[PDB]
Ligand binder design. Structure first.
Ligand SMILES: *[C@@H]1O[C@H](CO)[C@@H](O[C@@H]2O[C@H](CO)[C@@H](O)[C@H](O)[C@H]2NC(C)=O)[C@H](O)[C@H]1NC(C)=O
Ligand SMILES: *[C@@H]1O[C@H](CO)[C@@H](O[C@@H]2O[C@H](CO)[C@@H](O)[C@H](O)[C@H]2NC(C)=O)[C@H](O)[C@H]1NC(C)=O
Ligand SMILES: *[C@@H]1O[C@H](CO)[C@@H](O[C@@H]2O[C@H](CO)[C@@H](O)[C@H](O)[C@H]2NC(C)=O)[C@H](O)[C@H]1NC(C)=O
Ligand SMILES: *[C@@H]1O[C@H](CO)[C@@H](O[C@@H]2O[C@H](CO)[C@@H](O)[C@H](O)[C@H]2NC(C)=O)[C@H](O)[C@H]1NC(C)=O
Ligand SMILES: *[C@@H]1O[C@H](CO)[C@@H](O[C@@H]2O[C@H](CO)[C@@H](O)[C@H](O)[C@H]2NC(C)=O)[C@H](O)[C@H]1NC(C)=O
Ligand code: NAG
Ligand code: NAG
Ligand code: NAG
Ligand code: NAG
Ligand code: NAG
Ligand code: NAG
Lengths: 366, 244, 49
């Protein structure tokens, strides 16, 4: 290495610096708050009853943690279609607030709930924008909503003069006037009730059974985002140079116990020149200490190529505890300048030939 | 429950010296025995602070509100722009059990107040409210000196507080006491004016001894000294005089 | 009638290195439950015409 750095095939007596070294990190650790305040999805996806399609139930979700993993991994959902973003990456990106539109429709009306779709429900009951972002989940509810005598509790609109704007609900029961004959709120030759009730029954086949549908929309208002998945955490280690991500603060070093006393509202301290020195673990609320794991240059002491071919190796300012073929070598010696290997210490006192430091130096005899 | 009054509540709004009060921790870091120079919004030293013996007051960048409180008469706060359902509004109340924070569109009365019945149960501050967005309930805030600092930066509402036992008769004491952060709110409002909520005894209303101090903040550079325990012990205003 | 001879990949485990060629027509496990070489739920053919 000395020959390569010095770019020569011969080396004269002296000490040279070749390269540097540092202790590599072992593993990674992440620590985040204790995780709580889950969004109340249970009261929506397991509600006692669902609203009608023309009167779809709208719910506001804000300021909570939402775990989409359990919903995605659940096998009880017949249809799970996410258009704006991938369902896998839901826990990564998040927005400021969520709207949940829940209702019950027919099995064959499921694909009407999509951007760029047409139909009775798609035009007069629920309209979705083409640029809609979010997800749609649909599942069977035949065992509950369907009635042997016919469940007429669910109604839906069919007759309306104009279509519906996206995310618009109309509940007016005005008698539709298809013909030119005005009606004083009575049906007749050309006046009909816009609302018709479904006839869901257990004996009905696939495509006619009740279907519970929930549509999640994520809105992007300039207010700060507050609603998304939990942040994964892991246990901590000590006395090992590792890289850490304490609550978004990333750094590489060794973590030890510290006796510093914080105040109940700080999170991490520092000393000078914007250098972090102590952190508080969110899950335990303990004050730790950070020390950069050791590093330093290396040097070779040689008595000259023309004399011999054995050299001594010095690591500068490194405690002789983590040195690592020169892991053992010869009797390892510890100096105030670092750790020296390949040379033997003696009790005599001679003149100085190849200065080393801290008041000591070496020479060739070994 | 919305009635006006006859006795026009007018108070002798005098002026007095701000002295060296109104210093708060700007960040959540820890520093031991250091001198740190920081640029931020503060209350300038030896400024002019308004003393009130419930008029509408502009919010500007931030507000420093101090009260030589006796028997915790002062109860609530109202923030907003148009102070009605036209625009978002913020409301803060502090009863004997909890502090309640609401971010909603109320229809405030001309003379809103808490009111107590002489077992206290009376609430007639506004008339109607809907589209209520953010809610919060926490521990109650309150012969003492209560200092509060209200700021609104980047769609974030910061409230800092401090209480101090005082024995001086009339004016603000000549001393130093840093202000610790109290609460942060991630909400977006364009607050420009604010009010004060008074607790009158409804049994005729008798609440006149409501004296407090109001001051405004400006951006400048301060120099702060941190002792060994990380508590601010002294501060210097850089742009005051050549020595500073 | 439509040219269905041209097909493109849509699903993959990771990105492609520069000037890399991949031709394996293996099913993709889009969920936690393995497909075990069987098309099904969270199992899609990566090639689309
Ligand atoms: C709705 O209720 C069902 C029935 O309990 C829930 O499904 C169970 O969820 C628990 C989660 O703690 C699992 O341990 C069970 O194995 C699930 N059982 C079945 C049959 O699915 C479902 O999680 C509930 N959904 C919501 C949103 O609350
Ligand atoms: C964080 O959540 C964990 C989950 O239990 C708790 O932390 C420890 O919990 C065990 C058992 O509940 C207790 O014996 C320990 O004393 C807890 N540690 C601490 C530091 O309190 C606890 O509920 C939460 N802890 C914090 C600090 O938020
Ligand atoms: C190199 O490190 C070791 C331990 O990592 C140091 O040994 C410690 O020394 C201190 C003070 O001398 C003692 O209080 C500890 O009990 C020792 N621990 C062990 C495990 O021996 C050693 O002193 C360091 N080298 C130098 C030159 O200081
Ligand atoms: C509460 O929010 C609703 C929904 O935005 C407001 O309803 C709107 O009211 C305006 C009044 O001019 C109408 O023009 C809109 O068509 C209404 N939209 C909907 C969806 O109903 C309601 O006004 C808000 N409350 C208050 C007091 O302003
Ligand atoms: C800074 O913190 C130290 C550590 O607690 C404080 O020292 C203690 O203060 C209490 C309160 O008077 C005494 O009862 C203890 O005897 C003190 N212990 C020691 C070792 O000094 C100190 O008071 C705090 N404040 C300052 C300005 O140093
Ligand atoms: C090395 O030493 C030998 C004898 O000590 C000598 O003859 C030779 O010239 C030396 N090498 C060089 C490069 O001078
Ligand atoms: C030097 O002398 C000291 C004290 O007598 C002894 O401890 C040490 O082992 C000696 N060193 C060698 C290399 O003999
Ligand atoms: C505030 O200003 C008024 C006039 O503008 C002045 O009379 C008063 O002394 C000032 N208050 C101080 C300097 O504390
Ligand atoms: C204080 O207000 C909260 C919410 O407004 C209420 O729940 C609580 O009962 C009130 N306490 C008293 C003593 O009125
Ligand atoms: C004044 O503040 C101190 C410090 O918190 C507190 O112990 C005391 O009870 C307060 N007194 C009154 C009258 O609020
Ligand atoms: C505040 O006003 C600005 C401009 O008047 C507007 O762009 C912004 O949306 C408003 N924000 C709030 C929270 O009122």
């Amino acid at each position: 290495e000395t020959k390569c750095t010095l770019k020569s095939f011969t080396v004269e007596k002296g000490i040279y610096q070749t390269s540097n070294f540092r202790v590599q990190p072992t593993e990674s650790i992440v620590r985040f708050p204790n995780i709580t305040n889950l969004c109340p999805f249970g009261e929506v996806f397991n509600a006692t009853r669902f609203a009608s399609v023309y009167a779809w139930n709208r719910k506001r979700i804000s300021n909570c943690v939402a775990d989409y993993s359990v919903l995605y991994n659940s096998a009880s959902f017949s249809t799970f279609k996410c258009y704006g973003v991938s369902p896998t990456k839901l826990n990564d990106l998040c927005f400021t607030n969520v709207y949940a539109d829940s209702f019950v429709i027919r099995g064959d009306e499921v694909r009407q709930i999509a951007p760029g779709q047409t139909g009775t429900i798609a035009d007069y009951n629920y309209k979705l924008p083409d640029d809609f972002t979010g997800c749609v989940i649909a599942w069977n509810s035949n065992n509950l909503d369907s009635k042997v005598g016919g469940n007429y509790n669910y109604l839906y609109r069919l007759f309306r003069k104009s279509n519906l704007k996206p995310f618009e609900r109309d509940i007016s029961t005005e008698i539709y006037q298809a013909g030119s004959t005005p009606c004083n709120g009575v049906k007749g030759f050309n006046c009909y009730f816009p609302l018709q009730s479904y006839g869901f029954q257990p004996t009905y086949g696939v495509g006619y059974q009740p279907y519970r549908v929930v549509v999640l929309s994520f809105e992007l208002l300039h207010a700060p985002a507050t609603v998304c998945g939990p942040k994964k955490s892991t246990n901590l280690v000590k006395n090992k140079c590792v890289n850490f991500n304490f609550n978004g603060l990333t750094g590489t070093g060794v973590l030890t116990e510290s006796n510093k006393k914080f105040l109940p509202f700080q999170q991490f301290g520092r000393d000078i020149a914007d250098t972090t020195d102590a952190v508080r673990d969110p899950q335990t609320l303990e004050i730790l200490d950070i020390t950069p794991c050791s590093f330093g240059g290396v040097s070779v002491i040689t008595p000259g190529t023309n004399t011999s071919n054995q050299v001594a190796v010095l690591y500068q300012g490194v405690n002789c505890t983590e040195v690592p073929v020169y892991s053992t070598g010869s009797n390892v010696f510890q100096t105030r300048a670092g750790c020296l290997i390949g040379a033997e210490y003696v009790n005599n006192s001679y003149e100085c030939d190849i200065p080393i430091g801290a008041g000591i130096c070496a020479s060739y005899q070994s | 429950q919305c009635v006006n009054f006859t006795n026009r509540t007018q108070l002798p709004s005098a002026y007095t010296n701000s002295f060296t009060r109104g210093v708060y921790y700007p960040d959540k870091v820890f520093r031991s025995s250091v001198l740190h120079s920081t640029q931020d919004l503060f209350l300038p030293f030896f400024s002019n602070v308004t003393w009130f013996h419930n008029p509408v007051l502009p919010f500007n960048d931030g507000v420093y509100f101090a009260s030589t409180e006796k028997s915790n008469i002062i109860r609530g706060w109202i923030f907003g722009t148009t102070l009605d359902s036209k625009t978002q509004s913020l409301l803060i109340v502090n009863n004997a059990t909890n502090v309640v924070i609401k971010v909603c569109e109320f229809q405030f009365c001309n003379y809103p107040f808490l009111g107590v019945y002489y077992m206290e149960s009376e609430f007639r501050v506004y008339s109607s409210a809907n589209n209520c967005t953010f809610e919060y309930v926490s521990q109650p805030f309150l012969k003492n000196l209560s200092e509060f600092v209200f700021k609104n930066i980047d769609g974030y509402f910061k409230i800092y507080s401090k209480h101090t036992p005082i024995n001086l008769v009339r004016d603000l004491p000549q001393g130093f006491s840093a202000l610790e952060p109290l609460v942060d709110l991630p909400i977006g409002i364009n607050i420009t004016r604010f009010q004060t909520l008074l607790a009158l005894h409804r049994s005729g209303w008798t609440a006149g001894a409501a004296a407090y101090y109001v001051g405004y903040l400006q951006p400048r550079t301060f120099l702060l000294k941190y002792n060994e325990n990380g508590t601010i012990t002294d501060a210097v205003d850089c742009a005051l005089d050549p020595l500073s």
